[model samples]
Target chain A: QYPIINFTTAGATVQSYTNFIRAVRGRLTTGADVRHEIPVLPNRVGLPINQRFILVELSNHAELSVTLALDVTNAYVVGYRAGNSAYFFHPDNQEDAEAITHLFTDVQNRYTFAFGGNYDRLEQLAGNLRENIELGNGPLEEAISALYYYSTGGTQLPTLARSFIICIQMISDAARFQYIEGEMRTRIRYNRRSAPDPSVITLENSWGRLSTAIQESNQGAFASPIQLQRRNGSKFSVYDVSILIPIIALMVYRCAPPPSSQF
Target chain B: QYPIINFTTAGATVQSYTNFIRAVRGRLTTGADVRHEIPVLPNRVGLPINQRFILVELSNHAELSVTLALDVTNAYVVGYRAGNSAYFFHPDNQEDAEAITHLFTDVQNRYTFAFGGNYDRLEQLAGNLRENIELGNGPLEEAISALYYYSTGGTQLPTLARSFIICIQMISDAARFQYIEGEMRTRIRYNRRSAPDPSVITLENSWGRLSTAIQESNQGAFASPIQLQRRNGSKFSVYDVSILIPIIALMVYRCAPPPSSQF
Candidate 1:
């Protein structure tokens, strides 16, 4: 075959995660975000410019965009961008890493424990697989059978990996949504604090803008797609557009209230 | 003459910057960005697929690579594809809307400020000039004269704008340079933290990569440009590859001492 490669089989070991981690963590300094339509009045800067120079910063992933935003006046986008960025650096506890780390401990404690800190049993097991593999075609068939039997007893073998790799996944669905919340707080803060500039443009109409946004959300509509498109070879590629669905319906749509829900 | 509009001439009045701000913000939800080099990995996802369903994202602009990164992840990239998707969406924010918002504020405050709030007295000055222009070549010539005298009394008029629109630009610089610094951090972090993968093609060689990158940086080098390029019928446009240079010797020249020595 023409040199093919795959690293998918591994876990997110520190070493394994490193390659992409550095990649995901570094390499972008801009705070661009998906746009939203709002504010009939909502008012706003620097004298003239910003986002101009790159700050030679050194923050980790979660804070990257937040840091980018705070550096400027138009930091609103910064929060949302950080909201998604949180997904990458989403404070993962090495639950899985620990699961794998302790796996060997599990092995020694359960299976290999019989050998009592001596790897000789493992050596012997290897020799056994070696002898079976003398089958001349490939070394894995009997080794597979042996490994399978080992797991059947308790901490199964092939299935250990299959089950282990069965895998799980996080997200700061907390921060993901939290960003939206934090932002609304800021919106209200600004809504309360800022004066709409009439001489420049019609001032803020929070309710008007909000209402229009809601109706549009209800219809799942936009007068137009507020999106950017680029010319690809055959056709154009339109990036993405915001289409917030109406939430009023979602807010009241009944079931019943579970009193004191979680505790 | 034409439908030329200069919201820059307006105030923080919300409507003024709205167009540019919306234009800039709404158009950029997609997280498009530069590519990367390194690895077939010193190592890498499960051998699987994701972010494949709809890519249904409608928001445009700011997602800008941040969005791209947002779209996928195991927390993560699937091993096969991530090996590359890592190349995009690494968390940066230049929020399209904010960029536009501030662009307006910037106009009014710094750029337009030079014009002064005197858009008022100039209105009356026009009346005086109107009387002079009753000689009437269209009431414009002397009107221009009155405005000129306002500045020269003090050399008033032309400088308000001619010297005014003398606006230096940003953002591109803001973004332009920011992209560079961010990518460099990715490099340095990779250099210091991880070991190269032996199984696959590489891994990182911090010193080696650093040297290569710096040389690239010096020349604003890239082992290769990680940027995306687009095409029309004939010529092509490189989205932002070589924009790296002219970082003007930001590297290694310390220009700083340990904090213990200072604040």
Candidate 2:
């Protein structure tokens, strides 16, 4: 079983959102701190502690948590930037994870994907979203503007939860693609080039060993690999679960109503 | 004019190699140690100081140095792993840089490239090199084994300098591709997805601004951009000059004859 960290705040409600984002941001950058604080028993199978399951309770009764797994050994030598990573919704909230997972499945089948019926509409949405975002505007307009694609109704916006979820997932997917393309190019050259020296040799050996480890590690490390459905029903293993942090945080943030709203 | 930091060693000859690698490795990781130590005059356009030119003199009269330019702002948010970066041979070592640059151009046209005449031979060389390196063997055999490709006579080994340089460049190219591929995937989703939040907003803004700044920053940073020839005479900007560190270090290391082989 994974050790759990209970991160609960006792301060004012408004400040919790700020604290939540700051905590997650700091965690991403440092990747240690609270991560190392979890107590461990001797010879624990999870002694190295690469995966973290965190549960946070905010002042507004809105709880947030995520499962973050990282490839620590190869993250440095093989280029941590292109390393295998993904985020998953926690098992505790199986329903939420499933719902969001299915949402992504639908996105792949409906609008966001090229083969989907509404891909052209999604592209139009993306263009508008990019412009509005650049103009400091929110996705409110884009969500409502694309009613013809999402629904036949023109007046109603998608639920705030779903709207933000789609937005975050799309961006995360985009960011991942950008990294992979660059990494692919880097590898073509890296496998063949580098000044020969002991240090370079050390790095190459590390990369070589890591490559071997990645192959074996995937056999089974903690649990059975979580294979998520990609476009056209293709399956890709979900190894980088840290992708859920932003999703979880934004889900929490969207719960708060705008000041202009009387709710 | 770029302000220079003179890094001279006062230590023993053998120790300089160790010290040199440690210094350069630390420089690569932290990227701000000696880089920030230099003083700056007011209104210095190089105020941010992205490019650093260092001069290192070792105890055995060997010298090493290179220029390191980083896209600091985007390196964090745009997945620094996939950020636009490259290292060039320094302006100071014009001859060495040009020689290596042309060597890469030759590699692209003659051996390491897909359409190159000796590509099949190079692939054969790569497999053996990889196997040997994994087995804790040296590249000396691979160097000697490839006499047919580089030269018809099989009696002599290529100069140690050229041998190491070719090895390093090939590996570096591979590493770069690995990074670029990952980044591409990240961006594909990132452009369209993300949980709507102010912090996410801030990050997107930073990426957007950096994208804009990159377009402007390249027009004129310190001087006109140096263009190095690619395969088939195509030219590409040589922005990431930090690639020279390992080359310089290996060149310095190779100068020392193997203890087993007395000069």
Candidate 3:
């Protein structure tokens, strides 16, 4: 009902893995060229254009010592080095405005999350993921293992960035987000180029938000941050999801246009 | 002679302690108002100007974790959050050919240092000093205790700071220099408001270089760096030298013109 609200928020994709890393590296030293070409309308014509999004990023290395980096582009796309950022869209039309939201509405609706888990269990989860990421077998496998829970908040990182209080709201720790980010980044980089897949795991539930513990994932006040498990008690294998990440990245990268300056 | 190159380069002061710190806090956020009014001659009429200084600052909480912050005038100071840096002076005058280098052929004859001392003694020295600083018994006293191993390096701090290379080229570690720097800053700040001192301890010395051991300290290779001890072992007491730190700040702040941006 808000006059400012619109369903017109558009998303951009890093078509190439190298471009993604380049954005990460330049996250600090430079600003993104998110110029818009013309003003845009909402995805759902009548839906008010209150642009919003969850953009993800990574920190694959130098595990122990790191901080947060933040940037808000001319496009209203909040950029980060590690985790996804909340984005806003505008009437402005640029290539970037059409990039990211490629996730079908059905897919977007699949976002899911888990509420607070055993404090110690969460810690162990974080520890094991880092172990998997740093000294484990396949990052993909680790990522596969992470679908049970979702996040309420996004972990942050940026080039030449600055961080302090992570205070993640979802069921898992910031580390989990960082790990998934890295995994996705690696796959987006290597997989698509070698073997771009047309098929992807579209079954998903978008996690909603909660102030505290959530009994049912993505139910009510608690938004499932991650897609850890399915309502059916079944999960996709690592191989199944690996191709999907690239499928999305490749499509977005190839199809999305450059971001412009105005709405 | 080649063994140690102490008693080499020396510099002048920044004059005002208050202004110094003010400049420091705003160092990165704002550009240094380093513009001199009239092209002035060297502080010494005949002295050739060769300016250099990359000051160091410290967070000094654990004395274990530290980085580097570098800044300069409109001349383009590469900013860092922690660690030490190399600094330089210029006779370019932006015009007059001189202002500070007040260092000439005759003035370059000062150099000094001492080999290893009781291993435990140094640690004790550091410990006792921190006690004095933390307990409030005295800071000047700590400064005095430091005179023994005249540093080819000047302790770096900020009225208007930039630190971790300590750029202090002497024999001590960055921690000690950091400790001294903090003490000096407090005095320069307080004394200037109450009863500012005119005299300061602007002696000489530049330490050479070391590698990785300087983990949290300055790790850069070429350390022209520097010194700050007494003319003879009969150096000033911590109480005595303590006043000097602010004095240089007071004088430089008051007298030395702003740094110009030309090469």
Candidate 4:
């Protein structure tokens, strides 16, 4: 079994930090298996530049090259680096913090609302699955909880795939409700105050893709017999399942016009 | 006069390219004077990774340590690098292009509309100012044109400062009209569909800051005698004028609720 790495940024609550991780991971097409690299020495200014460097290892054996580092000095400093480009954030400084604050707080708030405040419910659900091997309730909540459990190393690949399918089905089912339909129709027509929003068109496109994905998955899309390759020509593997979490989160949680209540 | 390195991205019009630059510059705190470094050799796969590495030198002599490079391969590849982090754009690729397309096209389109398509009018105004050493017309257009002219290295420091004041005054005047007021009121009230939108609040805050900035500038904020320092502890210089273009663009052309006609 792969080692589980806990996220530890000082002053960030576990819930907020985990929510931030899930939210950020939901945005990027990064892999699931994350392991922390050894922190190097501090900068000349005594700031711990190498503190909390997490490495996300892709299924094709290529680790994502970027590092998101947070140095909690006199103030909270967040830095992202890859290749030769870097963005620094002094979260407490007046003008320095604006962009990064939005990145963290906005995602944190949205994901928190999306997932809802049911820590005990999620834990109990996870425990139930771990103890029994079969079950469910609140198809959306249960599916997401199972996905989260499997994401941090809980069960087999097929189970994870099934959970994702269930989640998508629930989201699709929710979308069919008249309340969601009305909200989306209104959002499409009026969000921009210009022409019909291009985002709405894109959402419709994603919905179509998701339907096809669900159909194909049911017809053995995630099975071993299927031969598929990524655009980079890499052979697909189990770690790729991590990419789907974002796809689900984005369609339902992030981009969809409807409320989280539908979920 | 500093060397003016023309933007030569394949398939991008000079007007669109300049608009992209202006919009980008309008957003960042980076300085204006840009110089292109020599292109490096292509990757083993024959992709020119360093085709257009432009450096933005700050007033403090610390260059903005980021390179926005575009390589015209079989597909357009855009890459940004600084320190140890990087972002890439393969504009032709299906999923890969979405975010970058929004980045370039959104800003490019907005700035294009913001400035208005009157190349001859701007040119004529610039020539008029250059020959007669005096001024005038469509205060918004003339001020923006003068600022654009100054941005490309035209006149004195005080002239640039005066032009900025003129631009701000025009934007502020436009904001006072009932048409803009009604739009902003409606925008603040209903844009999000949820409660009050944070972005609207921030826009109002920015409006306040602009008024204060204009007041201070008129009261000799730009004069050499006044001792001031940036957050980085560097003495401000002429190169800093590059930063204001975005500020004006943002308040008038970008985040503001009203149409470009107000300008």
For each predicted model, how many residue pairs clash, with residues at least 3 apart or on different chains?
Answer: 58, 87, 135, 11
Cα DockQ of the candidate 4 complex: 0.01
* Model 3 residue A203 lDDT score: 21
**Positional deviation of residue B232's Cα in model 1 after best superposition, in angstroms:** 46
Q: How close is candidate 4 to the true structure, as a TM-score?
A: 0.17
lDDT per residue as tens, model 3, B224-248:
2222344233333221111222222
Instruction: Find the candidate with the highest lDDT and give its number.
Output: 4
Give candidate 2 misplaced runs (Cα > 4 Å): A1-239, A246-263, B1-19, B22-263
lDDT of 2 by residue, B94-139 (tens): 4333322322122223222222112223335344332122110122
Over the stretch A180-243, how does candidate 3's per-residue lDDT look in tens digits? 3343344434432111111111121111111111222111111213233322344422211111
Evaluated on chain B only, what are the TM-scores of all the candidate structures, in order? 0.16, 0.22, 0.21, 0.20
Q: If you score just chain A, what TM-score does every candidate get?
A: 0.16, 0.22, 0.21, 0.20
- Best-to-worst order by lDDT is 4, 2, 3, 1
Off by over 4 Å in 4: A1-128, A131-263, B1-137, B140-164, B169-263
TM-score of model 2's chain A: 0.22
The interface RMSD values of the models, given in order, are 22.0, 24.6, 27.9, 26.1
